[PDB]
């Protein structure tokens, strides 16, 4: 009922839109906007609204409108997952317009493109890059190519994890267009070229980029960059993108004249290929190297060329993992949309799915697919990006039983990669045994294996209690089967020495004493290693926290050591000496192995990792992340990463008059909202009252006047009528899924940064602003945007000051007045301080968000309510949300968990230490698990919060007050 | 002068070693090569150059029969350790006659010059660029051989790598040239010149344009696509300085981008236009380019209708006159020929009128000229750093005395050409002014600031810089008092001195009565903010008495906040202040969100803080926009801030690391009897007879006049030389530093390094990379077909299949190497067959380095740890010895080499020879390349090193209380005379 309110409102407001001139144009494709984005149809989609949204494109007449709707519609922090399927199945159409020869058309398509881009679930990327791609290949209309080309540079920004995957696929795609006989394309091309290849990351042919780049544009430059590549040593992997990029300028290479590029091709091949620990990465392109270099082998007398040749084939054959007769093994289908697609539709056999939702299980498959790529399995993670879309047509249980069960399978597809070998690395052998371990008659470690490089360093992970300690021990006595004895290999277990010197004893004699060399000979070591005099003669027994490590690692080379033994390095010493025993152990020249519970530590020091899995010693190259992306029950481990518990919102920040957590910090009365264009109001007559206290939660199902009442609630929609009454200071933090699902945009940072990058403009740029397109801010010229002031033409010279204006702010302005507009003698001259005018913050933020946030910044300082992102105050933030500081400003939210990154997400949500907190049905994508530790938080939340959901168990024994819309009116 | 003999004998050995050259045969070309190499880079001429020798070469290079021949000795005089300054002049001079070649048909003379030129880029002094440069640009233009054009645009990109800082300030010259090649009609070349295009765009020191640098490129290649391009072009968001390089890739785009039709492109050019040269600070930097954009935008204003089109493109208009300094009727300011080669060498030969410069040293006076307009263009005036370049060529002719005085005139007028410069403007940066003021600044009636001016933004950044004693504290606590003329009144403008407060609390009073009496907000609501801040529940209750240091600044910027501060002033606030607590520090007013003014002598916290720098100047404030390092470059004088007392140019070397077995510093380390070497050609042995020890005691002078006797012997204690004959002592673990002058003038092609990375690089493999090695080319690092370097042993054809210990042999290293056995090396079998290790053979380490150096460099390295001698490159040890040489451990590892002085880099390099703690350090001739102060630091350092000294030198004065053994070579003998 007043949800099938909301197809009437949908209708008054597309019959709006469909007359809109460009001058009224973007007013209403805001309305439209706002209102569909939110909570307002129960279990199912406005069907015909995106069916005359669909047709009001493909008609000139209405093409400019149409798809302004749909560039407001998707913005990027508020794109509502119950939308964004249909707005994706509208690009194809949108692209073609993009070549229509009606210029205002043309644009408003090719802008519309990139909206969209910037707009959706980051993941779901399987199901709109193919549109832009068949579209680009088959189009005949060279300005089609150029927005679809600006559409997948936006997308390198938008999901670079994401487009990093599909390199191989891209790149092809690009380098063709960059042939096109079209200049305007051709340059194009080039610019999205550099673009995409921003997603390489790779350090080691970083500085060549514009090298391939070019060869891709002119063949003839592939002698001169073979040449130029040859010494390239790879350390880091050679992924997908890695090989895209190198791939075709080495098969041109191997088909080239010269025997030396041949053999110089050949060398890069085998150099760069031995670097691929998986086989099903260097498949899809064994097709472009076998041949050439079986060819070559045969053609070239010179024999030294052929010796390479003949290696740098041998090379491809094994990490390619070719069957006899040069066979490429049959590639994993797990990340393949066809495949998680034909799981998703088997799970969904028995559910009547109408024909509406069908696009939208096509979307799920595809999102399922995409993490099945990037590897992501556990049950938050697939709850977080699935479960919304679900709901759309399921409830809430059964879509949530249903998801789980298609993720187990979908990752049960998930192909067990091969284990290591160390032989053609770079080392002179330190050891190599096969050996089993027992301890007291238990078996630790069976008929295992265990090489160790020389100055490699290496750490040993395992479930704790499995014995790594004991190996080490082991390893320290010469207890392992095959080990090369001290004389031949010297180990020395750092701090672990064992004596009888007096605690008077001098450092100096302590060493002596060790018969490691005479007493001159110690103090220069120990002197080089920081030692004063003064220290060197004091007494053992004064050493402090980092001087017996240093002590140690000295009496390590006096002893000279090749293998350097730790356990828990870094306990009881500080940030300075853990920062120094890293830079140390970097350099030293020896190896060492290490065990420690701070994965940080291992991540900046290991270069491999020996893990316990079974009773087997299993290696991987890599430090500790590497070796969780290649082992995932190491998540479970005992390692500083992890690590995850509960946790707690911060208390509130102080309000000054409000005595008691029931007084009104916020209070409306005779309120009432209706959109500019329809019948009558969708809410009216609304009263409400909000505390440190309060514990509401808006339920029901959804509708025009639900939702509306969300949205004038949390500041998107300024109300049309009635007074708002709220603490100068009072704040609101409003928790959505789509910070949740996006944070994916940001892997490549830190928690730290990506608090910082949500924050530093002064607000939460995740839920201020959702009512505008934002996408502004290469708009140097949409500065020049004119305001109608009293009638008159004017342009911002400045905004100075803030100040409530109802559920949201207005800015104090000076202006520019404009005069004898349009002809030669145009001017905007400055007008005085008396014209300036307050203008609310929805008039300013497209174009002038800059100086909206220098005004923001400036009064948040001026009421002292402003928290300084500083690293050590955003640590002790997530501390209280359950992340470890040395993960939040030091590991990459790559390697975080699902459950982890929902911590983290609301770390960022609360980092404004609100008094209110709303959440928007947050059981529709959070596990029990997650809802648990949420539950109690909220219970404990020293502020006032509003729940809004359908779950009535999850409302019990947590909220009293209840808010429900009845024919756009509600009573508390 | 007075015949020197021993110089003379120099003169007969290149005559022989000559003759044994231009008979030379691919075979043994490499061989004397090496011969003539070694020998014409010693100390071998009294004041003079072997001037026949010179014509021999380049008479040898222009004919087909020597070609090869000659251009491959002159690849080997050009090796990137080792060419002398005595005779780089004369290697570039032949430049020309080599490019000629890099087109000849033949397809060896062609192949071999092409490699020279690489060569000798890769040699020279990258400040002597100017003098090189010419010779490349127009044998490039001219020549119609493609292939001498390919061997051209190779060495503009080994240039790039070799120079870059140099090259970047003649972008503007290259990119020009590199265009027009890019039109040729051979498809190779414009292949290669695309390529050699790719590779100058190095020289950007930013990332502004990264993303469009190919379609740049793309676009010089195409011009139809310029259109498209000005579109693309929305790097909109310009941030970093607009440099010459930076201009020398956009001008050119944009100026066609105004002339093109669609008056779309005529708008996009001027938008763009706008936003990137508002961001260039020194007019002369664009002021060659105007010419090439005003025209464009007069003619556009004129010409279009549409008025956005015209606010736009007139803006661009105002904009470019602004930042030009354009003058009357739109004039190009007047061009500062200051770094012309025309404008210093009018100034040398002024200086050398008096002077009888002989036919033969012409061109050396002209290299000279070409340095000094090098260091000019790169503001690098101070008087170590013209005599660590300068004076070496100058000595080729003049005597040391001489030179140094002139040099010192000739810098000092050459460097007063430099234009003054305008200030810098802070107008179109991001901020709302806090304050705009005119004013002078009196203390005490002494005038601190006369009729200067100071306006603050919001939100920024700044550091205050001056002389010691100009008023930067005085003026500090004018601001904070409202004593500057003009200054926002507190209500306004609300300024926090921190921890500058004075108030009569007890040492009883809690922290949060302490922040509550400043009447700064209720109890509650300090507490609250104290929390947000850091501050524990106990903390906020305990005495202020008990706040450790780090503590103290934290409250004193929450105070701050409490106050509603628009205005931090910190001075020196790093003191008292531990490595974690500064961090701190520079992360909350980075993100603070609050302007803040910085005093500190700490010029990485400044680089850490600032964003604009207010420096005293005379009795004015002038402002610049970046952090410290940038504020240096454009004020060289900066450099020389900590410099006031005489004591902080003083340095001290390292111990010497323990050696067992020696208990006295008489105790002959090295010992050298019955020595002799000779040159495989000459008539005679170049010493002989030669007997020596040298101990931790050892104070030497190896006096007298260049010659081959001198320059042998040398060149034998340091190693460079196998002995022909004799034997020679060493200790398993005696280390030699030799401290050259070369390694103070290549410094300059590091200056994006910090003195730790440099550190880092010169002993990248486990030993020195700049003196060891001299005698071989060392340049093949892309050598993988140059592994497979055919060893004859035993008569036996073999390849090195791994190498794994060191021993000791004569003055160097033998290598215990495995081999690989080949049968068949020439038929398809060709197999190369692993062999036993009792086959195993020990080949000198000379034989090794130039093919297979990675794996020399991995034996060394285990050595190193086995004898216990290895030396980590660890941040604090680096710092820890560099501070010993007397620089700033913070300066160290986070501030670029580029900002020190020509002093500090004497410290650096000098920091960098003894970085292993050498047991002897043998200097050559220091007194050349060094300044007087310089000299009276090394004297000092070199009279307490508790390491053996050996001076190669012609000063008797700098010898004297220094040293009391002599070394002076006759008629090919030595026997040492003095004491100890
Ligand atoms: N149109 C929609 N699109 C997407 N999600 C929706 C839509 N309608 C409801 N949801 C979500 O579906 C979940 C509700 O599941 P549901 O089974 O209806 O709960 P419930 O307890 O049965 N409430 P009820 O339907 O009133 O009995 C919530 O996450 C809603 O936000
Ligand atoms: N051929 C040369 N090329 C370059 N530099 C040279 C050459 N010959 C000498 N020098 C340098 O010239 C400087 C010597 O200048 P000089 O005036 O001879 O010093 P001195 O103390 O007066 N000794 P003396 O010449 O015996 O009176 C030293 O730095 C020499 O290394």
């Known amino acids: 009922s007043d949800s099938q309110q909301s197809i009437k409102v949908l209708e008054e407001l597309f019959q709006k839109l469909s007359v809109a001139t460009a001058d009224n144009r973007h007013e209403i494709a805001s309305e439209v906007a706002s209102f569909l984005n939110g909570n307002i149809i129960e279990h199912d989609v406005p069907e015909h609204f995106f069916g005359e949204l669909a047709k009001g494109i493909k008609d000139k007449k209405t093409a400019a409108n149409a798809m302004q709707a749909v560039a407001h519609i998707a913005n990027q922090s508020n794109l509502s997952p119950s939308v964004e399927p249909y707005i994706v199945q509208l690009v194809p159409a949108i692209c073609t317009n993009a070549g229509n020869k009606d210029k205002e058309i043309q644009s408003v398509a090719s802008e519309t493109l990139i909206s969209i881009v910037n707009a959706v679930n980051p993941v779901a990327i399987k199901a709109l890059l193919p549109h832009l791609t068949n579209a680009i290949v088959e189009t005949n209309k060279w300005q089609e190519k150029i927005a679809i080309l600006a559409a997948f540079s936006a997308m390198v920004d938008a999901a670079k994890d994401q487009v990093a995957l599909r390199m191989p696929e891209l790149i092809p795609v690009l380098s063709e267009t960059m042939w096109d006989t079209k200049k305007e394309v051709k340059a194009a091309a080039t610019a999205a070229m550099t673009k995409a290849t921003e997603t390489v990351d790779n350090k080691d042919i970083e500085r060549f980029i514009p090298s391939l780049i070019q060869c891709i544009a002119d063949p003839t430059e592939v002698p001169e960059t073979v040449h ?141 697919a995409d993490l099945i790529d990037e590897r992501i399995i556990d049950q938050q993670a697939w709850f977080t990006h699935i479960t919304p879309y679900m709901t759309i047509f399921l409830h809430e249980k059964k879509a949530k039983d249903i998801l789980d069960e298609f993720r187990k399978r979908a990752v049960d597809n998930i192909p067990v990669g091969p284990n290591f070998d160390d032989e053609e690395d770079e080392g002179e052998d330190l050891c190599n045994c096969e050996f089993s371990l027992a301890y007291g008659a238990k078996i630790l470690l069976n008929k295992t294996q265990l090489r160790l490089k020389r100055a490699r360093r290496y750490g040993i992970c395992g479930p704790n209690g499995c ?157 500790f992340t590497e070796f969780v992306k290649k082992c995932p029950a190491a998540k479970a481990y005992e390692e500083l990463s992890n690590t995850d518990l509960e946790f707690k919102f911060p208390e509130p920040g102080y309000l ?271 596990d029990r698990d997650s809802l648990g530790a949420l539950s109690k938080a909220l219970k404990e939340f020293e502020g006032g919060v509003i729940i809004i959901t359908h779950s009535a168990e999850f409302t019990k024994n947590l909220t009293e007050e209840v808010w429900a819309v009845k024919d756009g009116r509600m009573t508390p």
């Open 228 to 368: 130029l590549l040859g010494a390239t040593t790879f350390v880091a992997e050679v992924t997908p993108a890695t090989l895209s990029i190198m791939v075709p300028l080495l098969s041109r290479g191997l088909n080239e004249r010269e025997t030396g590029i041949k053999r110089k091709s050949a060398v890069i091949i085998d150099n760069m290929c031995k670097l691929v620990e998986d086989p099903q990465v260097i498949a899809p392109f064994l097709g472009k190297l076998l041949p050439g270099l079986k060819s070559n082998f045969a053609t070239i007398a010179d024999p030294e060329a052929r010796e390479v040749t003949l290696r740098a084939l041998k090379t491809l054959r094994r990490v390619g993992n070719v069957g006899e007769d040069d066979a490429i093994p049959e590639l994993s289908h797990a990340g393949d949309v066809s495949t998680t697609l034909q799981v998703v539709n088997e799970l969904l056999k028995d559910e009547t799915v109408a024909p509406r939702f069908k696009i939208v299980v096509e979307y799920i498959a595809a999102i399922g």
């Open 467 to 623: 014995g790594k300690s004991t190996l080490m021990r082991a390893i320290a006595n010469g207890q392992v089967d095959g080990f090369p004895t001290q004389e031949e290999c010297r180990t020395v277990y750092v701090e672990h020495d064992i004596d009888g010197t007096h605690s008077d004893t001098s450092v100096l004699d302590f060493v002596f004493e060790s018969g490691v060399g005479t007493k001159e000979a110690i103090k220069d070591k120990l002197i080089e290693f920081g030692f004063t005099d003064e220290m060197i003669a004091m007494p053992i027994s004064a050493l402090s926290g980092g001087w017996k490590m240093k002590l140690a690692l000295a009496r390590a080379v006096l002893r000279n050591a090749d293998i350097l033994l730790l356990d828990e390095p870094t306990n009881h010493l500080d940030t300075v000496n853990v920062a120094w025993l890293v830079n140390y152990l970097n350099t030293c020249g020896i190896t060492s192995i290490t065990i420690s519970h701070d994965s940080v530590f291992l991540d900046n020091v290991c270069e491999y990792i020996i893990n316990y899995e079974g009773l087997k010693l299993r290696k991987y190259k890599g430090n």
């Open 656 to 926: 000054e008059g409000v005595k008691t957590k029931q007084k009104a910090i916020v209070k409306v009365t005779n309120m009432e909202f209706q959109y500019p264009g329809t019948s009558k109001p969708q809410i009216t007559d609304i009263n409400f009252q909000c505390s440190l206290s309060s514990r509401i939660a808006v339920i029901g199902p959804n509708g025009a006047g639900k939702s509306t009442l969300i949205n004038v609630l949390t500041g998107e929609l300024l109300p049309t009528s009635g007074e708002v009454y709220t603490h100068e200071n009072c704040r609101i933090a409003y928790i959505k899924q789509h910070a949740f699902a996006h944070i994916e945009s940001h892997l490549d940072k830190t928690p730290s940064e990506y608090i910082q990058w949500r924050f530093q403009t002064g607000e939460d740029r995740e839920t201020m602003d959702r009512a505008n397109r934002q996408i502004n801010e290469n708009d140097a010229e949409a500065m020049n945007k004119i305001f109608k002031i009293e009638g008159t033409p004017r342009r911002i010279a400045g905004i100075h000051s803030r100040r409530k204006f109802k559920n949201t702010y207005e800015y104090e302005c000076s202006f520019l007045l404009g005069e004898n507009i349009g002809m030669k003698s145009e001017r905007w001259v400055p007008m005085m301080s008396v014209d300036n005018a307050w203008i609310p913050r929805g008039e300013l933020v497209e174009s002038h968000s800059k100086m909206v946030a220098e005004v923001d910044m400036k009064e948040a300082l001026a009421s002292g309510q402003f928290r300084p992102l500083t690293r050590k105050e955003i640590e002790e933030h997530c501390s209280m949300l359950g992340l470890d500081p040395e993960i939040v400003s030091h590991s990459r939210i790559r390697g975080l968990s699902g459950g982890q990154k929902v911590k983290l997400v609301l770390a960022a949500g609360t980092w404004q230490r609100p008094h209110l907190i709303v959440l928007d049905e947050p059981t529709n994508y959070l």
